């Protein structure tokens, strides 16, 4: 569970790329 955190961080960095496009949609709503 320790190293799991460091791995989740990278997964979060990537989720930002997809979340980027969603950021624009937030305004479209």
PDB file of C-alpha atoms in Angstrom:
ATOM      1  CA  UNK A   1       0.000   0.000   0.000  1.00  0.00           C
ATOM      2  CA  UNK A   2       3.059   2.219   0.436  1.00  0.00           C
ATOM      3  CA  UNK A   3       4.370   2.166  -3.136  1.00  0.00           C
ATOM      4  CA  UNK A   4       0.748   2.164  -4.312  1.00  0.00           C
ATOM      5  CA  UNK A   5       0.655   5.882  -3.560  1.00  0.00           C
ATOM      6  CA  UNK A   6       3.586   6.793  -5.802  1.00  0.00           C
ATOM      7  CA  UNK A   7       1.920   4.793  -8.581  1.00  0.00           C
ATOM      8  CA  UNK A   8      -1.393   6.592  -8.065  1.00  0.00           C
ATOM      9  CA  UNK A   9       0.409   9.898  -8.537  1.00  0.00           C
ATOM     10  CA  UNK A  10       1.449   9.021 -12.088  1.00  0.00           C
ATOM     11  CA  UNK A  11      -2.070   7.800 -12.802  1.00  0.00           C
ATOM     12  CA  UNK A  12      -3.296  11.206 -11.656  1.00  0.00           C
ATOM     13  CA  UNK A  13      -0.900  13.048 -13.957  1.00  0.00           C
ATOM     14  CA  UNK A  14      -2.438  11.225 -16.917  1.00  0.00           C
ATOM     15  CA  UNK A  15      -6.011  11.717 -15.715  1.00  0.00           C
ATOM     16  CA  UNK A  16      -5.281  15.414 -16.087  1.00  0.00           C
ATOM     17  CA  UNK A  17      -4.992  15.107 -19.858  1.00  0.00           C
ATOM     18  CA  UNK A  18      -8.521  13.715 -20.155  1.00  0.00           C
ATOM     19  CA  UNK A  19      -9.786  16.012 -17.400  1.00  0.00           C
ATOM     20  CA  UNK A  20      -8.468  18.904 -19.486  1.00  0.00           C
ATOM     21  CA  UNK A  21     -11.103  18.421 -22.171  1.00  0.00           C
ATOM     22  CA  UNK A  22     -13.742  17.941 -19.482  1.00  0.00           C
ATOM     23  CA  UNK A  23     -12.735  21.326 -18.083  1.00  0.00           C
ATOM     24  CA  UNK A  24     -14.047  23.001 -21.228  1.00  0.00           C
ATOM     25  CA  UNK A  25     -17.292  21.035 -21.077  1.00  0.00           C
ATOM     26  CA  UNK A  26     -17.829  22.329 -17.547  1.00  0.00           C
ATOM     27  CA  UNK A  27     -18.219  25.764 -19.117  1.00  0.00           C
ATOM     28  CA  UNK A  28     -20.476  24.468 -21.882  1.00  0.00           C
ATOM     29  CA  UNK A  29     -22.885  23.473 -19.112  1.00  0.00           C
TER      30      UNK A  29
END
